[PDB]
């Protein structure tokens, strides 16, 4: 029970879900915030909703309404839902350069001012679009100085605390990173928040990696797993969906390329059209990914693996018919005395417009603490716990040591 | 390739972009096609050289396409990727280094192919100046060609030395170049960029 455990008291008639959206005009001088709320329990006419935007202590906009939206089909509409659209003049944009936040409040109240309950979130204005082969944020083409980060503590195993999060966030920035890739599963809830406030682009990933199958395809192609799989993507989406830090979704990791991936990708695209979907399994360029995201592809040298080659990043873009942007999901294995060549990457990134970065692999050393014959500590690894089978050192590819101490 | 070259104008387009020059160019295009169109060796029709890019090229290229869909058209003027070519066909683009000149830069060839939007093959209409002691780096080219599909090779500049024979105080001959004929203005050795001497004896 490695993450928190909690208790929540909710009213009988309550806020079931809500999602924010923000469309903008050509120049961005104007936007609309869209909040859609659903409710649970018993629905009475005297019931209202109030969504209101705040910048600091200042009310930016407010909107009130009763439940029951638009006609959606022949059967009608949703009576337990309401969507509000609030117009905002010259909104302060959110980016990892200036994580401009607003706070948004939702009130479930009754027509006579009585408040049933309230829920909220930090809203951040921004746009993520692939356009013309380029990934744009807020109308500009991103350059992704990113890193793959694991939820790791040499002392607490995979339990996370704000301190550790926050420490990392800081190192990350100090060191010139924009983004984080949640390898390879949803992360502890705070994180998002922090990213929202500190400013980092976040790639959120479904908890799905079937690496050890033969082929890696095995399950991912099997309809029988389609349900199990589905729950791992959908729920992430229902959860993380309103965080501004999240800019792209990932189908999971190293689980080859199965029909299951394709439906879920389409799923996501229907559901939340505001963010690209990415998935690398199956060769980095499948139909299940909006972006070519190989891992370990060289700058200039090709790795012509039968079935699943690793083209030189530079060549990969001009392949016949290709037009998608390239952002490496992993690159630059940073295991112990390493990182030779980092430069090569940066120069290409800098020279090729459609090569908008990547994620170094990785952040920390997956080293664990152990004590000797005197209560003396020391860093433990693969098989140090009589663990079998084991891959020893393969757990130490971080840019910093488990205690957060920099690798040169 | 059509006999149309107005290199020396400022801008290069001055005529190619002048409706009044339409008819003239027109005929250099139309007649070439109508005479040569039956040879199987011709596989690519070109609009001339360095004449910049003008509304007249677009029209003319449209004509070709209309009348002889059997072949692609290509033209390098105005930046090598104009709407008047079916191929990116620059001259002297470097393999790995870019030359971003205003209005008409010269991207690293490998780089050019992925420029957002871009999907056409790339074949150098002129590359590797066989001028004197040259051809260095040659391989660099051969290697890209081979690694990138969309890099279809290219044409060396050029075959023969445009040198001319002259005779001395004793009727013994010698190879003369620009301005050796008291020609002014001229551009000297600039006329000798071949792979083989003007007598068909090869250069190294």
Nearest to A101, CA basis, from A91, A109, A110, A114: A91
Asked if the Cβ–Cβ distance from A323 to B147 is below 8 Å, we say no
Task: For residues B85 and B125, give the distance between their C-alpha atoms in angstroms, rounded to a whole number.
Answer: 12
From A141, which residue of chain B is nearest by alpha-carbon distance? B116
Residues 6 or more apart in contact with residue A240 via CB below 8 angstroms: A186, A192, A204, A246
Is there a catalytic annotation at residue A330? yes
Query: To what resolution in angstroms was this structure determined?
Result: 2.8
Q: Are A250 and A205 in contact (CB under 8 A)?
A: yes
- The CATH H-level superfamily of B1-204 is Glycosidases (3.20.20.80)
Q: Which fold has domain A127-408?
A: TIM Barrel (3.20.20)
From A300, which residue of chain B is nearest by alpha-carbon distance? B147
What is the least distance, in Å, from the CA of B110 to any CA of chain A?
A: 7
Task: Specify the CATH architecture of the domain A12-126.
Answer: Sandwich (2.60)
Is there a catalytic annotation at residue A117? no
What is the least distance, in Å, from the CA of B94 to any CA of chain A?
A: 14
Task: For residues A199 and A375, give the distance between their C-alpha atoms in angstroms, rounded to a whole number.
Answer: 40
DSSP class per residue in B3-55: S-B-TTSSSTTTTTT-GGGHHHHHHHHHHHHHHHTT-SS---EE--BS----H
Experimental method: X-ray
A29 reaches B (C-beta below 8 A):
no
Asked if the Cβ–Cβ distance from B110 to A351 is below 8 Å, we say no
The verdict on whether residue A280 carries a ligand-binding annotation is no
Asked if the Cβ–Cβ distance from A302 to B147 is below 8 Å, we say yes
What is the least distance, in Å, from the CA of A141 to any CA of chain B?
A: 12
The residue written with tokens 């290069």 in the block is B12
Which residue in the list B50, B97, B118, B169 is annotated as catalytic?
Answer: B50
A315 reaches B (C-beta below 8 A):
yes
Cα dihedral sign, A23-A53-A4-A16: negative
Of A302, A317, A321, the CB nearest to B114: A317
Query: What is the side-by-side order of every strand in the sheet holding A134-137?
Result: A128-131, A134-137, A140-141
Strand A201-205 to A179-182 pairing = parallel
Would you tell me which residues 264-303 of chain A have a C-beta closer than 8 angstroms to some C-beta of chain B?
A: 302
The residue extents of the domains of chain B are 1-204
Asked if the Cβ–Cβ distance from A354 to B116 is below 8 Å, we say yes
Task: For residues A100 and A103, give the distance between their C-alpha atoms in angstroms, rounded to a whole number.
Answer: 10
């Amino acid at each position: 029970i490695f993450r928190d455990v909690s208790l929540l008291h909710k009213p009988t008639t309550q806020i079931s879900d809500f999602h924010v959206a923000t469309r903008f005009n050509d120049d961005f001088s104007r936007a609309v915030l869209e909040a859609e709320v659903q409710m649970c329990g018993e629905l009475r006419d005297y019931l209202r909703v109030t969504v209101s935007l705040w910048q600091g202590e200042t009310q930016v906009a407010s909107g009130t309404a009763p439940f029951g939206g638009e006609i959606i089909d022949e059967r009608g509409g949703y009576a337990d839902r309401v969507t509000l659209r609030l117009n905002v003049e010259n909104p302060k944009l959110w980016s990892a350069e200036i994580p401009n936040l607003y706070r948004a409040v939702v009130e479930l109240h009754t027509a006579d001012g009585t408040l049933i309950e309230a829920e909220a979130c930090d809203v951040g204005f921004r746009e993520v679009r692939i356009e013309n082969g380029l990934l744009l944020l807020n109308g500009k083409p991103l350059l992704i100085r990113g890193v793959n980060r694991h939820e790791h503590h040499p002392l607490h195993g995979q339990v996370m605390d704000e301190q550790t999060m926050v420490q990392d966030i800081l190192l990350m920035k100090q060191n010139n990173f924009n983004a984080v890739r949640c390898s390879h599963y949803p992360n502890h809830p705070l994180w998002y928040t922090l990213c929202d406030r500190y400013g980092l682009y976040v790639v959120d990933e479904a908890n799905i990696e079937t690496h050890g199958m033969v082929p890696m395809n095995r399950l991912t192609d099997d309809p029988r797993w389609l349900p199990a799989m589905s729950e791992r993507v959908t729920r992430m989406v229902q959860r993380d969906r309103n965080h501004p830090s999240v800019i792209i979704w990932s189908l999971g990791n190293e689980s080859g390329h199965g029909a299951n991936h394709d439906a879920l990708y389409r799923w996501i695209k229907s559901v939340d059209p505001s963010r690209p979907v990415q998935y690398e399994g199956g060769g980095a360029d499948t139909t299940a990914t909006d972006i070519i995201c190989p891992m370990y592809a060289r700058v200039d040298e090709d790795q012509p693996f039968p079935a699943v080659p690793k083209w030189s990043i530079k060549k990969w873009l001009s392949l016949p018919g290709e037009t998608r942007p390239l952002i490496l999901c992993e690159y630059a294995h940073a295991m112990g005395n390493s990182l030779g060549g980092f430069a090569k990457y940066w120069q290409a990134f800098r020279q090729y417009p459609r090569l908008q970065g990547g994620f170094v692999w990785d952040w920390v050393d997956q080293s664990l603490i152990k004590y000797d014959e005197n209560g003396n500590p020391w860093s433990a690894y693969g098989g140090d716990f009589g663990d079998t089978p084991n891959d020893r050192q393969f757990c130490m590819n971080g840019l910093v040591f488990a205690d957060r101490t920099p690798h040169p």
